[PDB]
């Protein structure tokens, strides 16, 4: 029963906890996978900026999953945002990628 | 018409200084540099789901109290005999313009020298500051917030609200302009009226004042449980979707052919909550803010000195020797009294009442646990940091969780009709 | 000219809202004008896990 | 629905136009003429039995996903608000017709008689039907309607008093429902206009 | 201020935001179009049955047919429409020849007026003749 | 008034605006009037931009039409609802398989007239029942489309 | 480009103003729905118009209710019956050099009367088209009262 | 027909749904005939889904008619016998005491 309420005149937007309290988009959250699956587009458009630059960290409960490995040269700059953005955006109600 | 403009600042909660620090003060300025905008005080959740929280602002009452502390600290700067606006700092904050347009970080030259040594429980007059004397519109827009600050700061309990019953303020076409409000929640009406109040000065007996008074009286009368669907005040009442829940939604409603008989004459009273649950609901803070907006324009009857501690006694525009006493109530007992009246009149059965009581009990316990945990965290932080003591919420005590004087207030409210 | 139709002008005691129906229809009155809004119905549908 | 309690099996449905304190012609409505309770409809047994003996689900059904995908586009095209407004107007129109037809007939209806001093005759079913049709057309014109409105009321004696419905059990017992009319702003405005 | 017609005749800084890209690939089950067309067909309101009701000058609207014959004719028409709709030659679900002896059923028609008489002759004609019987002329 | 030639309407609307230059019946009538009741004398505290939500004015109208329109305005105002009720209704109708939300900003000049009573719905249903009149062509589409 | 209130995707800032005004934020569809798990908004437009550019038509025939009038809320008007003109002392009033002509609230006539003419001085957006119009009594108004049941007059 | 039955559940008060009169055995039916036995099977599983209030009586009287000459039940009327067709029992007054 998570419900997002928008912010007004500079007030931060909020989402509802299980306890009934409404919290802003920064902290340690626990999600089950299905919640992101069934609200994919809305959740992306709300949370991706705050995950990319803000201080939001989310734990997704998956159980078992496949994986892919990408290697890199440690002596040079490396950033993993493109791969993770693609993975997040390719989540649909019925399927996920590696 | 009000002609005396006095306000009183907050007192310390056992600490050595104002209960705010730099981090909290800078975290407040979300809508801009001005502490005068309404959004600095109130939060628009827009849902009945409710119960907003944060790391530094656990509750709505927390935000209201922190804003009160910030204003109490900052306003003591221009109010010195010299009357200069930005020559000294309070917690590295400075007034940025003579008309108090906003707060900024102090200049480096100011930061070199020691800050202002604030003292608590001060009573100040707006007419002493010359720019407030010269411009009635400026005095109007600032007193809109100063009056609500005083209503919070007068006593150690929750905020005060004013309820009036009178059949003479219904004259004219006010009935139609009230019927225009059907279907809106109390939060919507209160927020919009409070926002509108600052636009221009208004008349003491005008339509706006009588509108606000009627809205306040209807809300409180329906809240106590006197006015309901089968006993209405000129066909108006407030319907609650589910009483006793964590965040309640009250909706203005019309019912035909159940109008109650109202005696002639004008009467009023002052009511307030005493349990810490006032931190957790939004309706009571909205009622207090409407009362403050009304006070900024019109002169209300004085509060008796017996109801307030000696620091709040003999304030020229707020308290006096003869007047109305304050009626303090406790939330969970008021739920039972509401259910009692409704079930006695036949609107409610016994099983529905039992369901309401279960909800009220568990809600009260949950809120009490959260408030106690936050208070413990505050005390530990104060022990760890002796130079930056603070309180996120107005202090409370265990004995305040009692039933004191609830039934007396319920009878006093019922006597108005 | 019938002064009765124009009561609230010719009577220095008459309160502005007063009318004399059904006997006499007045030709000068007070009218209340609004600027109401009428939005569509907008809804957001979310799934239940 | 009743399983085998014969005394409670309902076989009749009727619509009533007259109040509960008058004696008139026993003008029963058309729905009573059916042998059954409603209009008969025939079904093939073979198709039903085949549909019962065969039937299956997809091997990958999740009810939440299926019903979200089923309900969203069905609700996205909804017309309940327009229906509510239409019902409000229909009730207004019925009450207006009753009040205005009381004035030119012997209807046993309490209405403040203001225009009695204007000469008139005493109207039968044909005259009242013409008058009621004109009223219905005028109201449809004012509110810009084109479908049905007050049409079934014009097909008999339009000198009515009150709409009600009822149905009958096998043992003679009856159940009668009479809606409790709220106000009607059009009718009160018309009465005010007559007073002026 | 905008004029609204009548359908019925009167009396005459970087803009780019992180998560906004549209590379999602999902197909619905059931599909949107199928349920949309079915709901469109279900949205339709009922037809107006004005047979047996007055005209704007008193004459009755309908056809001069007996009521029970009218009911049986309508049952046949509805059954044919059902057969058309399911594309079969013979309807599986029928409104006529059902095993119920429903021989007393009555339906509205143009064969009767409001006072219970027959429309062998329109009401306006009867008014005209009954009035013409009482006319008088200038003296010879 | 909107459109051209607003000065003609200025002359028509406010009788007192003409002075008392001559002697005549009209001049006597004008001199019999009080001078402080021409124009607007009441406006709302709430405003959008710099114009109020509602205004009270003194104008050339008639009492009967004003009464009719006031009653109609009240009738419409008793039907108003708010989007939270829309949320509750559409959430309960769906039987918990989806949830519906409807954001909005606070206001009191919003109007969404949709609330009615049970008696009105029952009256409409009875009308619709009489409409069938044992005509199967009326009911065949309903069953077919629902199936 | 997008609305943070509802999660829509748009292509114009003025259309953005329209969208935000739909939520009640100060800067023809009747219903609009959006879903959270894909990109597929749906809107409804009345079946009155021939324009159905990807929208859904609404068959329900619902009566017009909210309508607006910008004229005078008066239904009785004053008409002169016998004309006339009379000499006067004053013709116009002057300020510095310009002259302003006197104009009367009521006609200057020998006899004038009151007639019924609904919405004679109105300005509406939607017309309900049910006017009752009275000519001055020096003319004939019998067709007003012969309208309803007079089909077979001699 | 299967979908129409469920649709007609909602409108019990204006439309009554019954099984077609040709769905019963042809002349009377007899228990000696295999086709008539399959007819009984199909009819018996089809009947409970209609809104006809006399379905159980018709379900009983079908097998009652088919069993003529092998088993006899007590009939009170001298006009209505065990050989009255099962379709004719369409109103509550036709229910037999047996």
XYZ file of C-alpha atoms in Angstrom, chain D residues 105-191:
87
model
C -57.512 18.033 -13.282
C -59.163 16.286 -10.329
C -55.904 14.791 -9.040
C -56.013 14.074 -5.299
C -52.725 15.921 -4.762
C -52.050 18.731 -2.268
C -50.640 21.734 -4.150
C -51.189 25.403 -3.354
C -53.775 26.478 -5.946
C -52.776 29.948 -7.106
C -54.020 30.260 -10.702
C -57.583 29.126 -9.988
C -59.068 32.463 -11.080
C -58.038 31.850 -14.721
C -60.827 30.086 -16.664
C -60.228 26.446 -17.522
C -61.944 23.159 -18.220
C -61.574 19.775 -16.526
C -59.042 17.662 -18.363
C -59.361 14.024 -19.408
C -56.586 11.590 -20.307
C -56.167 12.892 -23.862
C -55.871 16.562 -22.877
C -53.513 15.780 -20.001
C -51.434 13.561 -22.294
C -51.010 16.403 -24.796
C -50.106 18.850 -22.020
C -47.602 16.426 -20.481
C -45.998 15.789 -23.866
C -45.493 19.522 -24.350
C -43.904 19.788 -20.895
C -41.559 16.876 -21.627
C -40.473 18.374 -24.950
C -39.815 21.780 -23.384
C -37.623 20.316 -20.648
C -35.635 18.220 -23.129
C -35.101 21.348 -25.225
C -33.835 23.325 -22.232
C -31.337 20.671 -21.157
C -30.288 19.657 -24.698
C -31.343 15.998 -24.493
C -32.148 13.585 -27.319
C -32.833 10.156 -25.765
C -35.764 9.004 -23.612
C -37.222 11.251 -20.909
C -40.659 10.787 -19.325
C -41.828 8.811 -22.375
C -43.398 5.814 -20.532
C -45.502 8.194 -18.429
C -47.284 9.571 -21.497
C -48.623 6.189 -22.619
C -51.642 5.975 -20.322
C -53.439 8.183 -17.830
C -50.846 10.902 -17.085
C -52.852 12.249 -14.111
C -50.622 10.458 -11.630
C -49.743 11.018 -7.983
C -46.747 8.860 -7.048
C -44.464 6.232 -8.594
C -43.982 2.923 -6.793
C -43.071 -0.690 -7.513
C -44.188 -4.014 -6.059
C -43.995 -7.780 -6.438
C -46.035 -10.782 -5.323
C -45.312 -14.129 -3.664
C -47.059 -17.423 -4.327
C -49.094 -17.205 -1.110
C -50.514 -13.748 -1.877
C -48.065 -11.658 0.149
C -46.775 -8.484 -1.497
C -43.762 -6.197 -1.240
C -44.200 -2.489 -1.996
C -41.421 0.092 -2.457
C -42.264 3.802 -2.563
C -39.296 6.177 -2.986
C -39.290 9.151 -0.612
C -39.138 12.225 -2.809
C -36.718 14.982 -1.801
C -37.307 18.554 -2.921
C -37.492 19.710 -6.520
C -36.042 23.135 -7.271
C -37.857 23.555 -10.604
C -41.287 22.941 -9.069
C -40.697 25.351 -6.177
C -39.427 28.010 -8.585
C -42.549 27.562 -10.728
C -44.798 27.922 -7.669
